[PDB]
Homo-oligomer: A and B are copies of this chain.
Amino acid sequence: GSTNDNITARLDRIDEKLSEILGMLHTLVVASAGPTSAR
Contacts and interface: CB of A to CB of B under 8 A. Distances in A.
Interface residues of A, number: 34
Given A3-B4, A10-B8, A28 B32 contact: yes
A28 to B, nearest CB: 5
B15 A15 contact: no
Interface of A: 2-8, 10-15, 17-22, 24-29, 31-39
Given A28-B25, A31-B29, A31-B33, A15 B13 contact: yes
A5 to B, nearest CB: 5
Contact of A35 (B5, B19, B24, B38): B38
Nearest to A39: B35
